[PDB]
Design a protein around this ligand. Structure first.
Ligand SMILES: CC(=O)N[C@H]1[C@@H](O[C@H]2[C@@H](O)[C@@H](CO)O[C@@H](O[C@H]3[C@H](O[C@@H]4O[C@@H](C)[C@@H](O)[C@@H](O)[C@@H]4O)[C@@H](O)[C@H](O)O[C@@H]3CO)[C@@H]2O[C@@H]2O[C@@H](C)[C@@H](O)[C@@H](O)[C@@H]2O)O[C@H](CO)[C@H](O)[C@@H]1O
Ligand SMILES: CC(=O)N[C@H]1[C@@H](O[C@H]2[C@@H](O)[C@@H](CO)O[C@@H](O[C@H]3[C@H](O[C@@H]4O[C@@H](C)[C@@H](O)[C@@H](O)[C@@H]4O)[C@@H](O)[C@H](O)O[C@@H]3CO)[C@@H]2O[C@@H]2O[C@@H](C)[C@@H](O)[C@@H](O)[C@@H]2O)O[C@H](CO)[C@H](O)[C@@H]1O
Ligand SMILES: CC(=O)N[C@H]1[C@@H](O[C@H]2[C@@H](O)[C@@H](CO)O[C@@H](O[C@H]3[C@H](O[C@@H]4O[C@@H](C)[C@@H](O)[C@@H](O)[C@@H]4O)[C@@H](O)[C@H](O)O[C@@H]3CO)[C@@H]2O[C@@H]2O[C@@H](C)[C@@H](O)[C@@H](O)[C@@H]2O)O[C@H](CO)[C@H](O)[C@@H]1O
Ligand SMILES: CC(=O)N[C@H]1[C@@H](O[C@H]2[C@@H](O)[C@@H](CO)O[C@@H](O[C@H]3[C@H](O[C@@H]4O[C@@H](C)[C@@H](O)[C@@H](O)[C@@H]4O)[C@@H](O)[C@H](O)O[C@@H]3CO)[C@@H]2O[C@@H]2O[C@@H](C)[C@@H](O)[C@@H](O)[C@@H]2O)O[C@H](CO)[C@H](O)[C@@H]1O
Ligand SMILES: CC(=O)N[C@H]1[C@@H](O[C@H]2[C@@H](O)[C@@H](CO)O[C@@H](O[C@H]3[C@H](O[C@@H]4O[C@@H](C)[C@@H](O)[C@@H](O)[C@@H]4O)[C@@H](O)[C@H](O)O[C@@H]3CO)[C@@H]2O[C@@H]2O[C@@H](C)[C@@H](O)[C@@H](O)[C@@H]2O)O[C@H](CO)[C@H](O)[C@@H]1O
Lengths: 98, 99, 100, 103, 103
């Protein structure tokens, strides 16, 4: 199994790593029908989503949990692995340090 | 998909954006039958619910209630709410926070 | 829908509103068989439960209420009011409101 | 219903109240097959477990077991002072039935 | 039941105890399909995973995997010192079976 976000990311098609190296500027969360999604934003101008939604179901909910608490604690994100065939780019993985 | 709360809100009928720019004044939570809901309040005088589940959105209602609770307790400044205004109190569809 | 804990409370029989205006003094949680409950306590001497499960909507709510009491206790968050069923010993929590 | 941990404890066979009046010294959590459990420790020398869910447990206890493990983790992380533990003492380590905290 | 992480580690095959006595350096989490996993990293050079749920996991492990990942995240965010890890050493990276923290 991969031992880093970059390794994991290189396994998938239509992905790229973003080096964020920053805390989340804004956190948006919606329960509107067909837009049950999370949107985060950075002062870089970068916008990301956790897409509207079976072990992936639990993982999707975990990701949204992680982004929320990461925003609330002002935790510095190292990288994001995102799918770049979506607008905004959809999050596949997150890494944080230190 | 939408890239902001304002864009998301615009996709829907009977919605409006409230600018809060404030922390939540009060959090109310009920487990009473037929009223399994949260109610939040602001010093502006605004009152909103997350509304009782009824006829993918089920986990989202739960997440919103989660978010509002931790937001209240940490006194986190809410930016905007997107709400349905065909209900009283207005029902939350989306929330945004900026740091 | 109701707009406050007081309005909500007045929709049900065998309820009343206690004005707590204080943090939780003690938190007790049990996983014993048929006593899967939370008990909370205040300086006033008041004692309340989240009572053992008997609707499908309510099961998720009972669990949330217990989550809420726990973190309310750990953060020393002032409870404004409790809406409670007074046909139980101790009184059983239907709703909670929090404001400083 | 019982109105205190002591009252509740007295309702079951093979239980006692350990008065702890201290924070958790160590939290141990396992996802190893058939030992999906939590062990907690105090500087008194006390070791306790939340038992693995099994045939001795009724359906209603399953969500409660998960809750108790939640509480112990957050209790450990926050250095929250535990007042009493109600434990079953026919297990090794003693098994947590209930916990109480006072501020 | 075992009364410590080392005792627990000794009930299983293909396990070893890593003594960390350190907070987590990095936390990585993925919802990518077939890689629904968490990876953690320490200053010592060590790397660990909580592996994707799979056929090798029994049904009681499913909630424990989710819990282990909940624990690691919050451990990372609070900078809480991890004492020991019980890891399966027949996976790369080593897979977490148990965790202990002490202060
Ligand atoms: C309001 C807000 O936060 N964002 C809105 C904004 O976002 C785009 C802009 O910020 C531009 C900068 O001109 O960058 C777009 O991203 C590029 C990306 O650029 C690189 O990363 C960004 C963050 C900057 O640092 C650039 O200097 C970098 O070159 C390219 O590498 C990538 O290949 O293509 C996208 C172009 O789409 C921002 O787009 C958003 O964020 C990125 C990460 C994607 O997820 C994309 O889908 C998002 O839309 O402007 C857009 C409209 O263009 C929206 O209004 C955003 O809300
Ligand atoms: C005490 C308390 O918190 N809430 C009770 C109160 O709520 C209403 C009042 O706060 C009035 C004051 O004018 O505004 C209502 O909202 C209006 C809204 O007003 C605008 O926004 C509020 C926050 C204020 O800042 C106003 O000055 C603004 O003009 C209008 O713009 C909107 O179009 O219509 C509503 C009323 O229909 C408050 O209503 C509550 O909160 C809003 C956001 C909705 O969710 C609404 O459904 C709520 O009722 O009075 C009401 C009864 O009028 C209840 O007793 C509340 O509990
Ligand atoms: C030790 C402890 O915390 N509780 C034990 C105690 O609890 C009862 C006492 O604290 C008495 C003291 O008068 O009050 C009971 O509550 C009354 C209630 O009194 C009013 O509210 C409380 C908060 C106090 O402020 C009183 O001074 C107030 O006047 C009345 O409002 C109500 O009509 O009647 C109840 C019960 O008669 C305490 O009862 C407990 O808490 C209340 C809120 C209910 O949930 C009730 O069911 C509880 O038993 O004594 C009991 C046994 O009587 C147990 O030993 C508690 O552990
Ligand atoms: C390493 C560690 O933390 N614990 C290991 C230890 O645990 C036992 C010791 O701490 C002995 C010391 O004699 O006490 C055992 O508990 C007794 C209990 O003793 C009293 O309470 C403890 C907490 C201390 O304060 C003692 O000084 C007190 O005398 C007796 O009162 C009771 O009647 O019987 C128990 C034993 O059953 C400790 O046992 C552990 O903790 C208790 C609370 C139970 O849950 C028990 O099952 C635990 O084993 O030694 C054991 C060896 O079996 C393990 O190595 C522990 O990990
Ligand atoms: C970037 C990063 O953090 N880690 C990458 C790194 O990890 C390996 C290295 O850090 C080497 C350094 O020699 O150690 C490997 O672990 C050994 C282990 O060594 C002992 O533990 C480490 C942490 C050090 O403190 C050593 O001094 C200790 O002696 C031996 O005990 C064990 O028998 O064998 C492994 C060799 O695989 C690190 O391996 C990673 O972490 C361990 C715990 C396993 O989980 C393993 O699967 C991991 O790969 O290099 C590897 C690839 O070589 C990856 O890129 C890591 O991400």
């Amino acid at each position: 199994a991969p031992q880093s976000i970059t390794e994991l990311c290189s396994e998938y098609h239509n992905t790229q790593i973003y080096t964020i190296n920053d805390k989340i500027l804004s956190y948006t969360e919606s329960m509107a029908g067909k837009r049950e999604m999370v949107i985060i934003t950075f002062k870089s101008g970068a916008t990301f989503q956790v897409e509207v939604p079976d072990s992936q179901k639990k993982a999707i909910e975990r990701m949204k949990d992680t982004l929320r608490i990461t925003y609330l604690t002002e935790t510095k994100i190292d990288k994001l692995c995102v799918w770049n065939n979506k607008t905004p780019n959809s999050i596949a993985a997150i890494s944080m340090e230190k």
